[PDB]
Protein backbone atom coordinates (compact mmCIF):
# COMPACT_ATOMS: atom_id res chain seq x y z
CA UNK A 1 0.00 0.00 0.00
CA UNK A 2 2.72 2.49 0.89
CA UNK A 3 4.48 2.47 -2.38
CA UNK A 4 1.16 3.72 -3.66
CA UNK A 5 2.61 7.23 -3.35
CA UNK A 6 5.81 8.86 -4.64
CA UNK A 7 6.93 10.02 -8.06
CA UNK A 8 9.01 6.70 -8.11
CA UNK A 9 9.54 3.92 -10.76
CA UNK A 10 6.92 1.35 -9.87
CA UNK A 11 9.03 -1.06 -11.93
CA UNK A 12 12.32 -1.03 -10.10
CA UNK A 13 10.85 -3.02 -7.24
CA UNK A 14 9.12 -6.28 -6.69
CA UNK A 15 7.37 -7.82 -3.83
CA UNK A 16 7.25 -11.27 -2.46
CA UNK A 17 6.32 -13.33 0.56
CA UNK A 18 8.93 -11.97 2.92
CA UNK A 19 10.28 -8.92 1.29
CA UNK A 20 10.49 -6.42 -1.46
CA UNK A 21 13.03 -6.44 -4.05
CA UNK A 22 14.61 -3.29 -5.24
CA UNK A 23 17.09 -2.23 -7.93
CA UNK A 24 19.95 0.16 -7.28
CA UNK A 25 22.48 0.40 -9.79
CA UNK A 26 21.40 1.42 -13.19
CA UNK A 27 17.75 1.51 -12.81
CA UNK A 28 18.85 3.27 -9.69
CA UNK A 29 20.57 5.77 -11.87
CA UNK A 30 17.55 6.17 -14.05
CA UNK A 31 15.19 7.02 -11.25
CA UNK A 32 17.54 9.61 -9.91
CA UNK A 33 17.46 11.51 -13.14
CA UNK A 34 13.82 11.03 -13.02
CA UNK A 35 13.68 12.35 -9.51
CA UNK A 36 15.21 15.61 -10.59
CA UNK A 37 12.80 15.74 -13.41
CA UNK A 38 9.84 15.91 -11.22
CA UNK A 39 11.13 18.59 -8.94
CA UNK A 40 11.01 20.51 -12.20
CA UNK A 41 7.72 19.04 -13.18
CA UNK A 42 6.78 18.96 -9.59
CA UNK A 43 8.38 22.06 -8.14
CA UNK A 44 6.59 24.00 -10.84
CA UNK A 45 3.34 22.23 -10.21
CA UNK A 46 3.67 22.84 -6.57
CA UNK A 47 4.11 26.58 -6.87
CA UNK A 48 0.89 27.31 -8.83
CA UNK A 49 -0.94 25.29 -6.26
CA UNK A 50 0.74 27.18 -3.40
CA UNK A 51 0.06 30.35 -5.28
CA UNK A 52 -3.47 29.41 -6.01
CA UNK A 53 -3.90 28.24 -2.55
CA UNK A 54 -3.43 31.59 -1.06
CA UNK A 55 -5.28 33.22 -3.92
CA UNK A 56 -8.46 31.72 -2.40
CA UNK A 57 -7.52 32.95 0.97
CA UNK A 58 -7.58 36.46 -0.18
CA UNK A 59 -11.23 35.88 -1.58
CA UNK A 60 -12.23 34.72 1.84
CA UNK A 61 -10.33 37.34 3.87
CA UNK A 62 -11.98 39.97 1.80
CA UNK A 63 -15.53 38.54 2.03
CA UNK A 64 -15.10 38.37 5.74
CA UNK A 65 -14.07 42.02 5.76
CA UNK A 66 -17.31 43.36 6.94
CA UNK A 67 -18.94 40.46 8.71
CA UNK A 68 -16.22 40.95 11.22
CA UNK A 69 -16.80 44.65 11.72
CA UNK A 70 -20.38 43.88 12.22
CA UNK A 71 -19.37 41.46 14.78
CA UNK A 72 -16.63 43.82 15.97
CA UNK A 73 -18.61 46.93 16.72
CA UNK A 74 -21.72 45.00 17.72
CA UNK A 75 -20.11 43.50 20.79
CA UNK A 76 -18.52 46.70 21.93
CA UNK A 77 -22.00 48.28 22.10
CA UNK A 78 -23.21 45.80 24.53
CA UNK A 79 -20.22 46.07 26.78
CA UNK A 80 -21.06 49.67 27.20
CA UNK A 81 -24.71 49.47 27.28
CA UNK A 82 -25.34 46.48 29.50
CA UNK A 83 -24.32 48.72 32.44
CA UNK A 84 -26.80 51.61 31.45
CA UNK A 85 -29.99 52.08 33.54
CA UNK A 86 -32.07 52.79 30.54
CA UNK A 87 -30.85 49.75 28.86
CA UNK A 88 -31.48 47.46 31.78
CA UNK A 89 -34.89 48.96 32.00
CA UNK A 90 -35.64 48.24 28.36
CA UNK A 91 -34.42 44.83 29.15
CA UNK A 92 -36.72 43.92 31.98
CA UNK A 93 -39.43 45.64 30.04
CA UNK A 94 -38.72 44.27 26.55
CA UNK A 95 -40.76 41.25 27.39
CA UNK A 96 -44.11 42.71 28.42
CA UNK A 97 -44.24 43.91 24.87
CA UNK A 98 -45.75 42.37 21.87
Amino acid sequence: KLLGGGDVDHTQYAFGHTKVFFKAGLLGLLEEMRDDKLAEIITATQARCRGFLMRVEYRAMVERRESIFCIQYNVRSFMNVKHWPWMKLFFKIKPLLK
Binding site: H17, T18, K19, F22
Partner: protein, 198 residues
Protein backbone atom coordinates in the same frame (compact mmCIF):
# COMPACT_ATOMS: atom_id res chain seq x y z
CA UNK B 1 5.81 -11.36 22.83
CA UNK B 2 2.06 -11.35 22.80
CA UNK B 3 2.19 -13.92 20.03
CA UNK B 4 4.77 -16.12 21.62
CA UNK B 5 3.17 -18.21 24.23
CA UNK B 6 2.78 -21.45 22.38
CA UNK B 7 6.53 -21.83 22.63
CA UNK B 8 6.93 -19.67 25.60
CA UNK B 9 9.77 -21.66 27.07
CA UNK B 10 11.35 -22.18 23.66
CA UNK B 11 10.77 -18.59 22.63
CA UNK B 12 14.12 -17.30 23.70
CA UNK B 13 15.76 -19.76 21.27
CA UNK B 14 13.37 -18.96 18.45
CA UNK B 15 12.84 -15.26 18.83
CA UNK B 16 14.05 -12.40 20.99
CA UNK B 17 12.15 -10.10 23.32
CA UNK B 18 10.48 -7.22 21.55
CA UNK B 19 12.91 -4.76 22.93
CA UNK B 20 15.98 -6.86 22.60
CA UNK B 21 15.04 -6.49 19.04
CA UNK B 22 14.17 -2.86 19.35
CA UNK B 23 17.29 -2.12 21.30
CA UNK B 24 19.23 -3.68 18.50
CA UNK B 25 17.63 -2.35 15.35
CA UNK B 26 17.29 1.15 16.74
CA UNK B 27 20.83 2.10 17.45
CA UNK B 28 23.48 4.39 16.05
CA UNK B 29 24.98 3.46 12.70
CA UNK B 30 27.62 5.03 10.41
CA UNK B 31 27.34 3.42 7.03
CA UNK B 32 30.10 5.21 5.18
CA UNK B 33 32.60 4.09 7.76
CA UNK B 34 31.40 0.81 9.22
CA UNK B 35 32.60 -2.21 7.25
CA UNK B 36 33.59 -5.92 7.07
CA UNK B 37 37.08 -6.84 5.96
CA UNK B 38 39.48 -9.55 4.92
CA UNK B 39 41.80 -10.94 7.47
CA UNK B 40 44.82 -13.13 7.22
CA UNK B 41 44.28 -15.01 10.51
CA UNK B 42 40.56 -14.69 11.12
CA UNK B 43 38.57 -14.96 7.90
CA UNK B 44 36.69 -11.69 7.96
CA UNK B 45 36.48 -9.47 10.92
CA UNK B 46 34.68 -6.15 11.33
CA UNK B 47 36.09 -2.69 11.48
CA UNK B 48 35.82 0.98 10.89
CA UNK B 49 37.29 2.66 7.88
CA UNK B 50 40.00 5.11 8.85
CA UNK B 51 41.49 6.40 5.68
CA UNK B 52 41.48 5.82 1.96
CA UNK B 53 44.63 5.11 -0.08
CA UNK B 54 42.84 5.76 -3.41
CA UNK B 55 42.39 2.00 -3.94
CA UNK B 56 43.68 0.73 -0.66
CA UNK B 57 42.01 0.87 2.62
CA UNK B 58 43.12 1.23 6.16
CA UNK B 59 40.84 -0.07 8.80
CA UNK B 60 40.59 -0.33 12.50
CA UNK B 61 39.40 -3.50 14.00
CA UNK B 62 37.16 -4.85 16.55
CA UNK B 63 39.79 -6.05 18.91
CA UNK B 64 42.06 -3.28 17.84
CA UNK B 65 44.09 -3.77 14.74
CA UNK B 66 44.95 -1.75 11.78
CA UNK B 67 45.30 -3.17 8.26
CA UNK B 68 45.62 -1.60 4.85
CA UNK B 69 43.79 -3.81 2.52
CA UNK B 70 42.63 -3.56 -1.15
CA UNK B 71 39.42 -1.89 -2.15
CA UNK B 72 37.79 -5.23 -2.64
CA UNK B 73 38.98 -6.73 0.54
CA UNK B 74 36.48 -4.36 2.01
CA UNK B 75 32.77 -5.07 2.31
CA UNK B 76 29.88 -2.97 3.52
CA UNK B 77 27.93 -3.70 6.67
CA UNK B 78 24.22 -3.91 7.03
CA UNK B 79 22.31 -1.32 8.95
CA UNK B 80 21.35 -2.46 12.33
CA UNK B 81 17.86 -3.05 11.06
CA UNK B 82 19.23 -6.38 9.93
CA UNK B 83 20.59 -7.74 13.11
CA UNK B 84 19.58 -11.33 13.45
CA UNK B 85 17.46 -11.59 10.41
CA UNK B 86 15.38 -14.65 10.05
CA UNK B 87 16.09 -14.61 6.33
CA UNK B 88 19.47 -13.39 5.41
CA UNK B 89 18.24 -13.09 1.91
CA UNK B 90 16.33 -10.08 2.96
CA UNK B 91 19.47 -8.29 3.75
CA UNK B 92 20.39 -5.48 1.40
CA UNK B 93 23.92 -6.63 1.61
CA UNK B 94 24.55 -9.95 -0.02
CA UNK B 95 28.14 -10.62 0.79
CA UNK B 96 30.16 -13.39 1.99
CA UNK B 97 30.87 -11.84 5.39
CA UNK B 98 27.42 -10.65 6.20
CA UNK B 99 26.19 -14.15 5.91
CA UNK B 100 28.78 -15.63 8.09
CA UNK B 101 28.21 -12.88 10.56
CA UNK B 102 24.43 -13.25 10.75
CA UNK B 103 24.56 -16.88 11.43
CA UNK B 104 27.19 -16.36 14.03
CA UNK B 105 25.37 -13.64 15.88
CA UNK B 106 22.12 -15.53 16.25
CA UNK B 107 23.98 -18.50 17.45
CA UNK B 108 25.84 -16.71 20.19
CA UNK B 109 22.29 -15.94 21.18
CA UNK B 110 21.39 -19.53 20.88
CA UNK B 111 19.31 -19.36 17.79
CA UNK B 112 20.10 -22.40 15.66
CA UNK B 113 17.59 -21.81 12.93
CA UNK B 114 18.14 -19.09 10.53
CA UNK B 115 16.82 -19.08 6.86
CA UNK B 116 18.97 -18.11 3.83
CA UNK B 117 16.54 -17.95 1.07
CA UNK B 118 14.78 -21.18 0.72
CA UNK B 119 17.17 -22.92 2.91
CA UNK B 120 16.80 -23.62 6.48
CA UNK B 121 20.13 -23.31 7.98
CA UNK B 122 20.70 -25.34 11.16
CA UNK B 123 23.61 -25.10 13.52
CA UNK B 124 24.67 -27.83 15.97
CA UNK B 125 23.81 -26.61 19.46
CA UNK B 126 26.16 -28.99 21.21
CA UNK B 127 23.92 -28.82 24.11
CA UNK B 128 20.18 -29.29 24.91
CA UNK B 129 17.30 -27.08 23.86
CA UNK B 130 13.55 -26.88 24.49
CA UNK B 131 13.10 -26.62 20.75
CA UNK B 132 12.01 -30.09 19.99
CA UNK B 133 9.47 -29.30 22.60
CA UNK B 134 6.19 -30.89 22.42
CA UNK B 135 4.64 -27.48 22.62
CA UNK B 136 6.43 -26.20 19.66
CA UNK B 137 5.27 -29.01 17.49
CA UNK B 138 1.71 -27.64 17.78
CA UNK B 139 2.77 -24.10 17.51
CA UNK B 140 4.28 -24.68 14.13
CA UNK B 141 1.15 -26.46 13.14
CA UNK B 142 -0.80 -24.70 10.36
CA UNK B 143 1.64 -21.74 10.10
CA UNK B 144 3.28 -20.23 7.02
CA UNK B 145 6.96 -19.48 7.61
CA UNK B 146 6.13 -15.84 7.85
CA UNK B 147 3.75 -16.39 10.74
CA UNK B 148 6.54 -17.99 12.78
CA UNK B 149 10.29 -17.78 13.41
CA UNK B 150 12.91 -19.88 11.67
CA UNK B 151 12.54 -23.54 12.45
CA UNK B 152 12.51 -26.98 10.84
CA UNK B 153 9.05 -27.75 11.77
CA UNK B 154 8.28 -24.75 9.66
CA UNK B 155 9.65 -26.46 6.68
CA UNK B 156 8.12 -29.72 7.71
CA UNK B 157 4.71 -28.39 8.23
CA UNK B 158 4.58 -26.30 5.21
CA UNK B 159 5.42 -29.33 3.23
CA UNK B 160 2.43 -31.06 4.61
CA UNK B 161 0.28 -28.06 4.02
CA UNK B 162 1.45 -27.61 0.57
CA UNK B 163 1.03 -31.25 0.15
CA UNK B 164 -2.69 -31.09 0.64
CA UNK B 165 -3.12 -27.58 -0.76
CA UNK B 166 -1.39 -28.07 -4.13
CA UNK B 167 -1.94 -31.83 -4.46
CA UNK B 168 1.74 -32.29 -5.23
CA UNK B 169 4.31 -34.47 -3.66
CA UNK B 170 6.99 -33.01 -1.54
CA UNK B 171 10.60 -33.42 -0.49
CA UNK B 172 13.02 -32.32 2.09
CA UNK B 173 16.64 -32.38 1.40
CA UNK B 174 18.85 -32.56 4.42
CA UNK B 175 22.54 -32.20 3.86
CA UNK B 176 25.80 -31.38 5.71
CA UNK B 177 29.22 -32.70 6.76
CA UNK B 178 29.84 -35.68 8.99
CA UNK B 179 29.38 -33.74 12.18
CA UNK B 180 26.60 -31.42 11.16
CA UNK B 181 23.98 -33.68 12.79
CA UNK B 182 21.55 -34.56 10.04
CA UNK B 183 20.21 -37.95 11.28
CA UNK B 184 19.08 -36.05 14.28
CA UNK B 185 17.11 -33.67 12.18
CA UNK B 186 15.90 -36.30 9.84
CA UNK B 187 14.65 -38.32 12.64
CA UNK B 188 13.13 -35.28 14.20
CA UNK B 189 11.37 -34.40 11.02
CA UNK B 190 10.03 -37.86 10.77
CA UNK B 191 8.54 -37.84 14.27
CA UNK B 192 6.91 -34.67 13.22
CA UNK B 193 5.09 -36.31 10.38
CA UNK B 194 4.06 -39.24 12.41
CA UNK B 195 2.67 -37.07 15.18
CA UNK B 196 0.80 -34.43 13.23
CA UNK B 197 -0.99 -36.93 10.99
CA UNK B 198 -1.34 -40.29 12.56
Amino acid sequence: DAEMAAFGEAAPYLRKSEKERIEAQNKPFDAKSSVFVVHPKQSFVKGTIQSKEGGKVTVKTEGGETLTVKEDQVFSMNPPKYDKIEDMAMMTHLHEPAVLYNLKERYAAWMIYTYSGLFCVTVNPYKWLPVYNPKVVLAYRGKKRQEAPPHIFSISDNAYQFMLTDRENQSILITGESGAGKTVNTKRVIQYFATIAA
